[PDB]
Design a protein around this nucleic acid. Structure first.
Ligand SMILES: Nc1ccn([C@@H]2O[C@H](COP(=O)(O)OP(=O)(O)OP(=O)(O)O)C[C@H]2O)c(=O)n1
Ligand SMILES: Nc1ccn([C@@H]2O[C@H](COP(=O)(O)OP(=O)(O)OP(=O)(O)O)C[C@H]2O)c(=O)n1
Ligand SMILES: O=C1C=CN([C@@H]2O[C@H](COP(=O)(O)OP(=O)(O)OP(=O)(O)O)C[C@H]2O)C(O)N1
Ligand SMILES: [Mn+2]
Ligand SMILES: [Mn+2]
Length: 1264
RNA sequence: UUAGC
């Protein structure tokens, strides 16, 4: 550690709260990090006096592995396959030797890559060579699933941990987290690596590079070492920053060692990933004596996902685990995988917790953080053959007699059918009719928005489309000479812009390209990049599904992302007397096939949509005629609408299946097209479609099936008490059944179990394998809840990991910083020990803030000041002579954040600046007689501030584009969007109207006429950058570092004029014994105190924020938030109604709606959040889990504590000021360590009025 | 070649 101490001494003290932080020391540390060689990090590890408790037997078979060759074979289709040994799953990367297949590297003689000789043979067609190349490429792919070299994270840990224990400012004592000499993952990392390197000077087992991965030429290396080491590093960092229990952490290391000890690390990890969750979370409190759980009320309507805290629910044996015992299966799993030692220890401990409190949930959390975080990996061929193969077993098919004759591609399900499909058909028919009935549906703008949804800078199987079109002799414009990426649906859109649906129809059956995705703790999933016509024709399906989810069920739309994964719902459902069954449907995509669902859904939509869509085109699709054979004998022609024409074509594809074109770049020679009937993921229907069937079937069960299959009075009573509208929330294939409790306690466990067995039996009838889980836990959207307490899953957030499906190289330097920030933010959301985490983040950042640059022997260096990370969101540990750890990680981001920390120590700064020569005769309004301009330029505070706001990736704009083809393109884009003249006429109106009432007021008019340009811009930036464009990026950042400044942004200079007075701490908003988020307990002072004083956000953030916009959606390409800002800004700037009416016309609205909303906006009392946008203020993400709405409303007094001040009074017409003022107050409160405090407006330098003009100046100057 | 939200 003397190696580390000597080289980072001063820096360590700065991020440990002992010494102030200075950019001079930060940048040096950066340079030290950059000069540390990989073997040096191991040399440093050697200096650690590890304790015996940090050691455990390392399996000798982790080193000696068999040849890879016996693990593969060539199949009947000549594709290189993984040869199974431990079951159908044994398809991942096998644990084998690999040195024998490498050629030493030219320079790094001790490291090696796959022999070029072997690849050439493989490329020639040699079976043995292909087998070896595949194994080589896949094993390499496995090692790449990390963000940067493991040594960088380790070195950072060493530097951060050299600071020793950290003193808690609030608790007033040092933490008792064991030092590194007790870190078992680290000890293993050093020992395993040292054992591999052996006599070799090079200490690294492998090198994560750009030229690819290279392996240390040791006969002890294994394809499993990269993943294993990656797991140990995460655990190493977490034991120190999450304050994890070392004893548990070892159980986690043991499993990993066993994974490396197995024949396939990846596979073993997958089969045992449930060990920690099963032996703790799903086995808590078989005995219960005390503790408290939340007591929440679900507000009406339940669809708002809004709850209110009502106190605490004392716990007793009355609430002990009533759900079935998983002991037997749990021990069986351990026995089968040689981990019964771990399982047992886990069970024995889980039993000692008889009180539900901070101690026990932290235990669960702790346990669940020890699960491997590797992104499982296997060759594309293997994913495709395992995912697009299995078919649903429809145990009770729809009788063939129950279909009518064909109506084109569809057959109506007779209304005499006795099949359960009867109900599935009614629901889709109803929704389809009502949706097509809505007037909006027929509005040109709406159809433009829909058509735009899939016009993105993402792929759409471009090539395949082109050829399916060539098959019918129809060539698409190639726009030869344009600097944009051709494999984008944006490019596709332009090619198809001027072609009749009849000419592009065939493309609906074109092949699908391969798209892959690796996930932590899950198998890789294949994806289908549908093409523009395929996406277009799918609208009907998507729209009807949306109608169901918005009007007929209780569902959440999103992918996820904490808090908007509706944390509140989880607290409620998991809180006694409430109970929840976690429903899931396995192989959902393979379960939605034509045979039962799609054939029915297609028919119901086609029929229910008939009367309202009649005689009309839809989204560019014409109406037509199709053969009609419904009635026996009677065979005629039927006039169908364009919307129906869509279902007609979509039905053709769903029926045939998808032609998945598989070009496995990891497996030489594995090129094949695989036909599959599994549902598409890349469809705009997918998510919403599955969410819809989910609720529909569950509704059918609870209403029909269930009741009809049991005469059990209790099961019938329970069932009758459940409605999909109140008690069943779902998203995609995930379901959460919430059984509200009574005063008599919770519903009988045995009755619930009966109910569930009926649900299971029910699914088999139509090919669905329900994955039901009744264990006293709530698990929805990968969020874990117990007794009202959320349990973050640290293992699903690998600190070092990163999905990398493709072979392409990582993004150029800068890019990594964003990733490091995201790592920080997860730690804040996951609840790690705030100080330990903040200090480590500083070490990690500093270790990635410097990069070597080239300009032609012009060897320089790009260095980000420490101040750039603050701007990005990382709080200061201690600056300007202030006390240590006064800043919380809830410090806002950007300007709002800069204003907050600076305001919290304004005087300190001034006093310090002066005391250090930074004095002047000019008295600064914010910094008194401090020479703040000369100070910030020297410390690189301005420099860093501006560097933070510059692009972290190369820009392609500026590429020479021949004006003519450039115009043809943007023209094509335009025609695609301006298909319907009515829309265009609308925008034109807004335009001439704008020149009269709005032009001049603001300069950011969002216009549909911008879309073509924004779209082109996107297709451009999607293409690969050039080494030159990379140089231009560095030059920009490097120029901003040279330049000197005299001020901050115009807005931040305005906020600084506002001074406050922090006062009395807020009273608790929730009980202090109440466990709300494991890890967030009295042991994690700042997060914990914030949670308690501020209170938890008890509503769905998506519902909440949906109430801060006048318009929810708009043509993809425009910004809903921009439009909302433009309108409020025009209002705030005194613009006339007609001006807002003009703005709305310009983004597609009908004059009537335009005038209506315009007139509505004018007279509205805009809420804080919504209004705060006029000046680009946004609720910080880190705040999302807290009750910020209440902080704004009741704890940020705008009336000075001692009455009214001339400067503080808010001008008559400047009421909007109050919204902006609330953010500034909140900013300071949230940034200060400890309890939320009530803050009071103390002063506004030039008065409110002056401030308003200052803001309005900014407003009217935006985009000049 | 590398999807929808
Ligand atoms: N002032 C410097 C010099 C080097 N490096 C880092 O060094 C790495 C590769 O170059 P080296 O060969 O390691 O640098 P040298 O300066 O030549 O080595 P030292 O003086 O011991 O000789 C990458 C580069 O960012 C750095 O950050 N700052
Ligand atoms: N923004 C960037 C990123 C990389 N490079 C160039 O790429 C070359 C090597 O790539 P890296 O692997 O990214 O640089 P290293 O110094 O070898 O180490 P790493 O980025 O961790 O620092 C040398 C460097 O000049 C550059 O000029 N500008
Ligand atoms: O990036 C993503 C991630 C999930 N998606 C959808 O959600 C579901 C299923 O969710 P999950 O449980 O994660 O996938 P399964 O195949 O059902 O995993 P398994 O049976 O172990 O549960 C299938 C997809 O349609 C999606 O479309 N895109
Ligand atoms: Mn599933
Ligand atoms: Mn799922």
């Amino acid at each position: 550690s003397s190696m580390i101490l000597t080289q980072f001494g001063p820096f360590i003290e700065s991020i440990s709260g002992i010494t102030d932080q200075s950019n001079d020391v930060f940048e040096d540390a950066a340079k030290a990090f950059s000069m540390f060689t990989r073997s040096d990090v191991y040399k440093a590890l050697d200096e650690i006096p590890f304790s015996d408790d940090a050691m455990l037997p390392i399996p000798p078979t982790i080193y000696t592995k068999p040849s890879h060759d016996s693990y593969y074979y060539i199949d009947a289709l000549n594709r290189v396959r993984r040869k199974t040994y431990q079951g159908p799953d044994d398809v991942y990367v096998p644990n084998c030797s690999i040195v024998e297949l490498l050629e030493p590297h030219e320079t790094l003689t001790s490291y090696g890559r796959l022999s070029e000789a072997i690849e050439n043979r493989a490329k020639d067609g040699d079976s043995q060579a292909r087998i070896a190349t595949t194994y080589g490429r896949i094993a390499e792919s496995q090692a790449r699933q990390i963000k940067a070299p493991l040594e960088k994270f380790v070195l950072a840990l060493l530097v951060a941990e050299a600071g020793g224990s950290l003193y808690d400012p609030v608790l007033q004592k040092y933490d008792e987290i064991p030092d590194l000499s007790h870190n078992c993952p680290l000890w293993c990392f050093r020992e395993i690596c040292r054992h591999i390197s052996g006599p070799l000077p090079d200490r690294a087992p492998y090198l994560y590079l750009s030229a690819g991965v290279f392996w240390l030429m040791s006969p002890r290396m294994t394809s499993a070492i990269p993943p294993l080491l990656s797991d140990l590093v995460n655990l190493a960092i977490l034991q120190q920053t999450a304050g994890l229990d070392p004893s548990l952490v070892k159980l986690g290391v043991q499993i990993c060692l066993h994974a490396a000890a197995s024949s396939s690390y990846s596979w073993f990890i997958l089969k045992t990933k449930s060990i920690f969750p099963q032996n703790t979370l799903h086995s808590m409190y078989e005995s219960l004596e005390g503790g408290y759980c939340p007591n929440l009320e679900w507000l009406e309507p339940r669809s708002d996902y809004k709850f209110m805290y009502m106190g605490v629910m004392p716990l007793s044996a009355k609430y002990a685990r009533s759900a079935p015992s998983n002991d037997k299966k749990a021990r069986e799993l351990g026995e089968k995988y040689g981990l019964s030692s771990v399982v047992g220890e886990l069970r024995k401990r889980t039993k000692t917790y008889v009180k539900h409190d901070f101690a026990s949930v932290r235990y669960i959390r702790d346990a669940m953080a020890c699960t491997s975080g590797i992104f499982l990996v296997r060759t594309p061929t293997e994913t495709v053959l395992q995912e697009y193969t299995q078919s649903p077993e429809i145990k009770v098919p729809i009788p063939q007699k129950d279909w009518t004759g064909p109506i084109g591609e569809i057959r109506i399900l007779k209304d005499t059918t006795s099949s359960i499909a009867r109900y599935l058909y009614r629901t889709w028919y109803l929704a389809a009719a009502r949706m097509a009935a809505q007037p909006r549906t027929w509005d040109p703008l709406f159809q433009a928005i829909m058509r735009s949804q899939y016009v993105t800078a993402r792929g759409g199987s471009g090539a395949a489309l082109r050829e399916s079109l060539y098959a019918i002799n129809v060539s698409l414009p190639d726009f030869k000479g344009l600097p944009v990426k051709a494999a984008t649906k944006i490019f596709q859109a332009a090619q198809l812009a001027n072609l009749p649906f009849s000419h592009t129809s065939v493309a609906i059956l074109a092949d699908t390209s391969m798209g892959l995705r690796n996930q932590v703790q899950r198998r890789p999933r294949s994806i289908m990049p549908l093409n523009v016509p395929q996406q277009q024709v799918s609208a009907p399906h998507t729209l009807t599904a949306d109608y169901i989810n918005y009007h007929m069920n209780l569902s959440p739309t999103s992918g996820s992302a904490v808090i908007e994964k509706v944390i509140p719902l989880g607290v409620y459902a998991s809180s006694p007397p409430n109970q929840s069954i976690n429903i899931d449907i396995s192989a959902c995509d393979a379960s939605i096939t034509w045979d039962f669902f799609l054939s029915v859904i297609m028919a119901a939509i086609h029929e229910g949509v008939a009367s309202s869509s009649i005689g009309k085109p839809f989204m560019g699709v014409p109406a037509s005629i199709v053969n009609d054979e419904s009635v026996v004998g009677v065979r005629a022609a039927r006039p169908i609408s364009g919307m129906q024409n869509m279902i007609q074509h979509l039905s053709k594809l769903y029926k045939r299946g998808f032609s998945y074109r598989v070009n496995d770049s990891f497996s030489p020679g594995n090129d094949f097209t695989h036909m599959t009937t599994t549902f598409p993921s890349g469809s705009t229907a997918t998510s919403t479609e599955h969410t819809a069937n989910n609720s529909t079937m569950m509704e059918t069960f609870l209403t029909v099936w269930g009741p009809e299959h049991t005469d059990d009075p209790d099961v019938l009573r329970l069932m009758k008490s459940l409605t999909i509208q109140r008690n069943y929330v779902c998203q995609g294939d995930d379901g959460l059944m919430i059984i509200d409790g009574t005063t008599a306690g919770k519903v009988n466990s045995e009755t619930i179990q009966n109910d569930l067995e009926l649900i299971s039996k029910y699914g088999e009838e139509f090919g669905w394998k329900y994955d039901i889980a009744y264990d006293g836990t709530a698990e929805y959207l990968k969020l874990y809840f117990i007794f009202g307490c959320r349990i973050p899953n640290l293992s699903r957030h690998p600190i070092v990991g990163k999905e990398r499906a493709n072979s392409s190289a990582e993004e150029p330097w800068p890019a990594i910083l964003d990733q490091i920030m995201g790592v920080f933010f997860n730690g804040v959301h996951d609840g790690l020990q705030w100080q330990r985490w903040i200090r480590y983040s500083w070490a990690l950042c500093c270790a990635f803030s410097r990069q070597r640059t080239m300009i032609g022997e012009s060897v320089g260096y790009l260095q980000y000041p420490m101040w750039s990370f603050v701007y990005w969101g990382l709080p200061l540990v201690k600056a300007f002579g202030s006390d240590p750890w006064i800043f919380s990680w809830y410090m806002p981001t950007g300007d709002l954040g800069m204003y907050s920390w600076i305001s919290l120590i304004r005087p300190l700064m001034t006093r310090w600046m002066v005391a250090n020569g930074y004095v002047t005769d000019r008295c600064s309004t914010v910094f008194g007689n401090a020479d703040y301009r000369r100070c910030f330029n020297e410390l690189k505070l301005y420099q860093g501030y501006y560097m933070a706001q510059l692009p972290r990736n190369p820009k392609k704009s500026g590429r020479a584009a021949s004006r003519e083809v450039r115009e043809q393109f943007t023209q094509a884009l335009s025609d695609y969007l301006m298909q319907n003249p009515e829309l265009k006429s609308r925008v034109l109106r807004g335009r001439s109207e704008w020149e009269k009432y709005g032009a001049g007021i603001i300069h950011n008019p969002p216009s549909l006429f911008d879309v073509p340009h924004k779209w082109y811009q996107g297709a451009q930036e999607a293409a690969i950058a050039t080494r030159e464009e990379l140089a231009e990026m560095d030059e920009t950042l490097m120029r901003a570092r040279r330049h000197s400044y005299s001020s901050f942004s115009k807005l931040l200079e305005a906020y600084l004029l506002v001074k406050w007075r922090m006062c009395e701490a807020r009273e608790p908003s929730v009980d202090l014994r109440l466990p709300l988020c494991a890890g967030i307990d009295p042991l994690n002072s700042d997060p914990f105190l914030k949670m308690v004083s501020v209170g938890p956000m008890l509503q769905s953030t998506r519902k909440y924020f949906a109430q801060t916009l006048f318009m929810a959606k708009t043509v993809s390409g425009l910004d809903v938030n921009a439009i909302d800002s433009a309108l409020l800004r025009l209002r705030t700037l005194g613009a006339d109604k007609k001006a807002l009416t003009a703005q709305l016309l310009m983004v597609g609205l009908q004059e009537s709606e335009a005038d209506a909303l315009a007139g509505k906006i004018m007279l509205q009392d805009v809420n804080t959040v919504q209004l705060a946008r006029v000046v680009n203020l946004a609720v910080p993400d880190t705040w999302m889990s807290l009750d910020f709405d209440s902080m704004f409303k009741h704890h940020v007094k705008l009336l000075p504590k001692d009455g009214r001040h001339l400067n503080t009074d808010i001008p008559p017409r400047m009421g909007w000021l109050r919204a902006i003022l609330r953010f500034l107050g909140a900013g300071m409160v949230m940034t200060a360590t400890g309890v939320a405090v009530d803050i009071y407006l103390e002063d506004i330098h030039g008065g409110g009025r002056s401030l308003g003009q200052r803001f309005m100046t900014w407003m009217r100057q935006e985009g000049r």
